[PDB]
Each structure stands twice: as C-alpha cells, then as structure tokens.
C-alpha cells in the first residue's frame, strides 16, 4: 500500500530531520579530480575518496558568496533535507562538512550525465521514453510532498541518468519543508508556475506545473514557454496559452492541459484525488508504477560507461583552486551545517 509505504518513509525522515548528521568527513580525505559544474555560490567536482577508492560528486559552496546571494537559509535547507531523505530516484548525500571558507556536500557520482545533455543532443524523446522519465518524477514528488517538502527546481539540468538508465534528482538548493504557503521567488524561468511569477503564496502545486513543463520539453525538444529574455518568458506563462506539436498524442495533450493549468482548483496533483489524478491518467495507462519504483522496467537508453572516474558525459569547465582561509568566515550563519 502506497499510504503505508509513505507512512513508514515519514517516520524514517522525521528522525533524521530532527537530529541531522554533521561533520562526517574532511576535505583531506578526498582527491580532487575535475570540475563537473559551476553555479553562482558554488561548484561541483568529481573527487575520489582515498579510504574506499569510491568516486563522488562534491558540491563546494563559498560561505561568503552564499551570504551575498542571501541563500543562507536555503543552503541549510538543502543539507538538512538531503541527509534525511531516502528514495530510489534521489541522489544520496554521503558526507557533509565545512571549513573556514566553504561548505561541502559529498554525493553519489552519476557518470551517465545530465538529461539536459542527452535531450539537446538527441533533440527530443519519444512519448514512451518521456513517459518512463516522467513516471520517476511522479513517484519522487509523491514521496517528497508526503514529507511536506517542495522541490522547486525541476528541469533537465538537474536530472542525471544512472548506469541502469533511471533518473537521479540533483540540486536541493530551493527545497523547503513547509506546511501551507510560501513566498520565495525562486526556480528557473521556463519552469515557474504563474503563481510564483505573480508573487502569490504558493504550495506543492508549483512542482506539478514544473512536471508539465518537463514532459512537454522532453517530448517536444523545446519548452512550452520560451524567449530570449526571462521577462518575455514570464509574459508567455501568465497568458499560459500553450501550443502543442502536431506529433503530440491526444492523451499527452490532455495530461499537459491539466498540469499546465493556471487555475489551482483544476491543476492535477493539487486536487482532492491528489497524485492519483496523474497516476490514473490515460497517458500513463501502460505504466506499472510498482515496477518503476522497483527498477524492474527496462530503460529506453543506457549511458555509455567508460569506467569508474570517467567524465566524458559531462562538459568541461575552467578549473579553479579550492582556497581555504586561515580565518573562519561566517561561523554563526552556518553553525548548524
């Protein structure tokens, strides 16, 4: 039973939520290999852990840059939530620590690369291919939302493909435990629900809208609302007129009309019948939800595996030193990390 599965999942999460793990490794325990990505207050590096010889993705955040960008509480949220959760399609936080200058989250490394990369290269996914990935997100949000968590940055750039061709969700920087409404303007322009743009309080329904955007983008090869500047993207979302490619199946268009629904009383995922409106839709008629969770379903695409440590499915970035000041920065702000 989904209900009883989720109930026990909540008991597991709550214990870790209320007593967060802290300071479970040190920088000098890892060899730094290669930068795999960069953001505004941080980067992600491939590292090797000397004691096990395991490869990980180590997220390094500059505390001073976090403070400037007003992301203190969001960073505390990210680490606190990630050490507490456990789901087959969420990338696992293995260790966390901090030093004078930086915060570190060490995650399982996913060498297959980002969905973004494969999607842009291949162009678009067929409906069964898209449906297989969407299913995993539907179950992931069902899990997260049951824990009162909103994810708030669904996009292909945050979805990695593992060695079995299943999805791993990355980047919890905007994830938040909230019962009721919240107000932060955050996300990525193409993926923002109209509520967010119009500066209303919003809730987990913004994740289900984001799923509509992702499904459209996977099946079409471009998002439903695009332009050269974000302001132009926002104008399009709030009008919310969507046009579907002629190749979209009838069922797909009807699912997307219900996900990309400006009206919250009518948006799927939000309604009295919850996720089941989504799960029991015709577009998902062929989906065996248990087998997906169990990873028994055969994946449409398996990444080229060139070994442990391989970074060929990732782009190249400029390397930059990991500087650690001799003085502690921002000690009070990040005390609980």
């Amino acid at each position: 039973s989904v209900k009883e599965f989720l109930a026990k999942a909540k008991e597991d999460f709550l214990k870790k939520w209320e007593n967060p793990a802290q300071n479970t490794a040190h920088l000098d325990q890892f060899e730094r290999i290669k930068t795999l990505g960069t953001g505004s207050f941080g980067r992600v590096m491939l590292v090797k852990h000397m004691e096990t010889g395991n490869h990980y993705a180590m997220k390094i955040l500059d505390k001073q840059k976090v403070v400037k960008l007003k992301q203190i509480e969001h960073t505390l949220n990210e680490k606190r939530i990630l050490q507490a959760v456990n789901f087959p399609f969420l990338v696992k936080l293995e260790f966390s620590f901090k030093d004078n200058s930086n915060l570190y989250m060490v995650m399982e490394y996913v060498p297959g690369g980002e969905m973004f990369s494969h999607l842009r290269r291949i162009g678009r996914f067929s409906e069964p291919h898209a449906r297989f990935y969407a299913a995993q997100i539907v179950l992931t949000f069902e899990y997260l939302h049951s824990l009162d968590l909103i994810y708030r940055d669904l996009k292909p750039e945050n979805l990695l493909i593992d060695q079995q061709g299943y999805i791993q969700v990355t980047d919890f920087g905007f994830a938040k435990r909230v019962k009721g409404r919240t107000w932060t303007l955050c996300g990525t322009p193409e993926y923002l629900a109209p509520e967010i743009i119009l500066s209303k309080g919003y809730n987990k329904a913004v994740d289900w809208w984001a799923l509509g955007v992702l499904i459209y983008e996977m099946a079409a090869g471009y998002p439903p609302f695009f332009a050269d500047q974000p302001i132009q993207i926002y104008e399009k979302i709030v009008s919310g007129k969507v046009r579907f490619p002629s190749h979209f199946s009838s069922d797909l268009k009807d699912l997307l009309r219900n996900l990309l629904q400006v009206d919250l009383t009518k948006r799927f995922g939000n309604l009295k019948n919850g996720v089941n409106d989504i799960k029991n839709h015709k577009w998902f008629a062929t989906t065996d939800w248990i087998a997906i969770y169990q990873r028994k379903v055969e994946a449409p695409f398996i990444p080229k595996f060139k070994g442990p440590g391989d970074t060929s499915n990732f782009d190249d970035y400029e390397e930059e030193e990991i500087r650690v000041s001799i003085n502690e920065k921002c000690g009070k702000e990040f005390s609980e990390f």
Partner: peptide, 20 residues
C-alpha cells in the same frame, strides 16, 4: 518552425536558477 526558433534563441544552453 518552432524548433528553428528555439535553436536560434539564447536559451538552448544550461539555464540558471533565479531568485529575488
């Protein structure tokens, strides 16, 4: 075509998150 317009746009690369 819509594909052509997307590919000619400045938002075919990795998209940055926003916040206030």
């Amino acid at each position: 075509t819509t594909y052509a317009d997307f590919i000619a746009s400045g938002r075919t690369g990795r998209r940055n998150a926003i916040h206030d």
